[PDB]
Amino acid sequence: YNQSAIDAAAEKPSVRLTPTMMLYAGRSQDGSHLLKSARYLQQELPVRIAHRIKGFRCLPFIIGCNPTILHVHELYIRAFQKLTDFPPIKDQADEAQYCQLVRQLLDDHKDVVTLLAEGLRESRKHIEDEKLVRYFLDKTLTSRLGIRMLATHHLALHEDKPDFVGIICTRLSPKKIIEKWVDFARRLCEHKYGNAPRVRINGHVAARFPFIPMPLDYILPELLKNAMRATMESHLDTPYNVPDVVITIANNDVDLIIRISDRGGGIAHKDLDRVMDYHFTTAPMHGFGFGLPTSRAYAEYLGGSLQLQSLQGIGTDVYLRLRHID
Amino acid sequence: YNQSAIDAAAEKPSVRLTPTMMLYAGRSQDGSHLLKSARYLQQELPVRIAHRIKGFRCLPFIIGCNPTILHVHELYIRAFQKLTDFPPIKDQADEAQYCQLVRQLLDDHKDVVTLLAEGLRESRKHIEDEKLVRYFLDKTLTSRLGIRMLATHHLALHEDKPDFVGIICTRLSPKKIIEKWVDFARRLCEHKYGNAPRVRINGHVAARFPFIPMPLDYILPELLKNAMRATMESHLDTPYNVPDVVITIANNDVDLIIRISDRGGGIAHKDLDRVMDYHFTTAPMHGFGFGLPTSRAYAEYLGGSLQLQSLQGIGTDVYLRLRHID
Ligand SMILES: CCC1(COc2ccc(-c3csc(-c4ccccc4C(=O)O)n3)cn2)CC1
Ligand SMILES: CCC1(COc2ccc(-c3csc(-c4ccccc4C(=O)O)n3)cn2)CC1
Ligand SMILES: Nc1ncnc2c1ncn2[C@@H]1O[C@H](COP(=O)(O)OP(=O)(O)O)[C@@H](O)[C@H]1O
Ligand SMILES: Nc1ncnc2c1ncn2[C@@H]1O[C@H](COP(=O)(O)OP(=O)(O)O)[C@@H](O)[C@H]1O
Ligand SMILES: [Mg+2]
Ligand SMILES: [Mg+2]
């Protein structure tokens, strides 16, 4: 690329808007909170993009040369250009034009991860470091989550969604968000297998607290698709009589724990170390190998964890932990 | 100590009798299997003792000087002397005299761990390495388990216990051994709290396989005492209505998994890193701090693991894994 403008922002450090600082925006009888947030987003978005362009520049030359990798690298450069070229936000007209660019760039970059994984897969013969692919995809996925959180938050500040301040839900019920995806995952499972296991939810079912549901909107359907597929493939002779998937909610002052326990035979000993690798699968629902590593990258980025406990021959317990807001 | 006889056996490596090699002893119409095993035990017992005397010699001087530590060190030296002084086993008379010495030495050393922990506790002010105490107690406990397995196996070869070849049960049912300790632990819990949680056992309830129950005879009552105490202390207002402790058996070709799931509020975040430390407790049943670290040292020595999964505010799932025989 050899661009000096990008070099300037690759070294300047990132600024993360804390959940409490995000909530401290509600100047309704003025609209001054809208401009304050947009002025931050305008400055922060190119820094995040440049930090990732730096990652593409640090890829070994032979890999960075792949036409698909180069295309995604080019996309990140043009995105940085489009964002920095925009003049500073002064009024409601300057804020509105930025929101349109952000929405277009959020749609132009929707398939970056799929192109990146393909480019990296195509380059397997030249990849010497086994961790290279995992660390590059982990960092790309978490950078995008960070960007998508800031961008979606500012765009949602224009909506008057009940119980929400942008992307922060002030009254989130973990039981309701689980229920929302349980019915969705059962429909996908029913389509493939003719049936789906019934889901039972116990624990702190009435817990309510402020939280950002965005990461849970990815993790929960992925973990439910895994638990349901496994339960069906291990009860092939009785597809009509499959054991329930039991979800437990544990809410304490430190974190939120969601445990998903299935009776799907568990993860085999030989596969136990490969399940967290990108592309690894034993099979859209399945046939991807992204659900587990992406969900862990997500949980860890947000101060939590994704831990698996396999009981080979019986089932698996998946523990999703996420740190509380503030 | 400065004893040259012990120096000779501290360097000679250990020989471990594999489960299949132990089972290959049943020369009933001769009694030749009895002498072959005793001739091994006579040679192996001083090597194990010397390897541990070497550990006492490697303790920092200030700690090894503690009167309690010195007493246990002296006990190990006198044990090595008594065993090596015995003349080689040639007939049924020479085998019988060794069995009496082994039974006496197994009774003389019954309180070694309690004296050792006390001596180490007394020396806390001089202990600089935090891992020193954990590693010394882990190595002492596993050495003793190894010795107790060999000694008890040979002594049990004289018994005609059904479904057993010394200490190996040919038809072990994990459900039955769990049941055996469940009623025992409930009696101890009832004595302290006025009630105990009912225990539910599911999974591979009818699994049967060859196995050494000795380590399970320690781990299961300890893990059940922990799950029951926790369930009672978290349901103080309703001691009469406490949630069940649910045990799941998973039997596959690689290992045996026993999961103990309680609804006892879980292990607090602040205590989560200290629970595996010797002496750490939040309180004979309780007030010891040995149950968890000893059980893990045991599981790992036998090619398995002891893993804890805390759901703070709800309960804890404890996963005991043990590698299969052969
Ligand atoms: C060049 C900077 C831009 C584009 O930033 C992004 C960030 C995230 C996404 C996005 C769309 S769908 C999505 C996703 C969802 C679930 C799980 C994984 C992903 C993922 O693909 O990362 N993220 C798109 N553009 C602000 C203009
Ligand atoms: C000097 C070598 C000897 C003595 O060897 C041992 C080994 C083990 C034990 C023993 C008794 S009770 C026991 C225990 C049970 C459950 C959990 C922990 C322990 C423990 O104290 O290690 N182990 C005693 N003497 C063969 C003559
Ligand atoms: N609950 C589970 N029980 C059994 N196997 C599982 C479970 N969750 C995941 N797996 C295994 O891990 C593999 C990778 O999972 P994942 O990353 O979600 O991708 P996918 O399911 O789309 O292939 C799966 O193909 C499956 O073999
Ligand atoms: N199932 C459990 N639920 C909650 N706390 C537990 C559980 N198991 C162990 N603990 C905690 O770990 C501490 C140490 O346990 P352990 O080593 O068994 O010793 P003890 O229970 O005799 O004190 C206990 O004092 C208790 O605070
Ligand atoms: Mg998946
Ligand atoms: Mg205990």
Residue numbers in the entry:
A (entry chain A), B (entry chain A): 24 to 306, 332 to 374
Would you copy out the relevant sentences from the publication that reported this structure?
The first committed step is BCKA decarboxylation by branched-chain ketoacid dehydrogenase (BCKDH). BCKA flux through the complex is inhibited by E1α phosphorylation (Ser337 in the full-length human protein) by branched-chain ketoacid dehydrogenase kinase (BDK or BCKDK). BCKDHE2 makes up the complex core, and BDK and PPM1k are thought to compete for E2 binding to regulate activity.
The terminal methyl group of S3 positioned at the cusp of the lipophilic pocket filled by the halo-dithiophene motif of PF-07208254 presented an opportunity to improve potency by filling this pocket with lipophilic groups. This work culminated in the discovery of two analogs, PF-07238025 (cellular IC50 = 59 nM) and PF-07247685 (cellular IC50 = 3 nM) with PF-07247685 having a cellular potency three orders of magnitude greater than BT2. The profound potency improvements over S3 and previously known BDK inhibitors can be attributed to the addition of the branched alkyl chains present in both molecules. Figure 3B and Supplementary Fig. 4C show the X-ray crystal structure of PF-07247685 bound to BDK. The central thiazole and benzoic acid of PF-07247685 overlap with S3 and make similar interactions, while the butyl cyclopropyl group extends into the hydrophobic pocket of the allosteric site and makes extensive hydrophobic interactions. In contrast, thiazole BDK inhibitors PF-07238025 and PF-07247685 increased fluorescence signal with EC50 values ± SE of 19 ± 1.7 nM (n = 27) and 2.2 ± 0.35 nM (n = 5), respectively, also in line with their in vitro inhibitory potency values, suggesting closer BDK-E2 proximity with these compounds, and thus BDK-E2 stabilization. In contrast, binding of stabilizers decreases flexibility of LBP residues, which may stabilize interactions with the E2 LBD, leading to the increased BDK-E2 interaction seen in the PPI assay. However, PF-07238025 and PF-07247685 protrude into the BDK ASC, which would physically interfere with E1 positioning in the cleft and prevent phosphorylation. BDK is then stabilized on the BCKDH complex, protecting it from degradation and leading to BDK protein accumulation. Conversely, thiazoles PF-07238025 and PF-07247685 very potently inhibited BDK activity but did not improve metabolism chronically and were associated with a BCKA rebound at low compound concentrations due to increased BDK protein content.
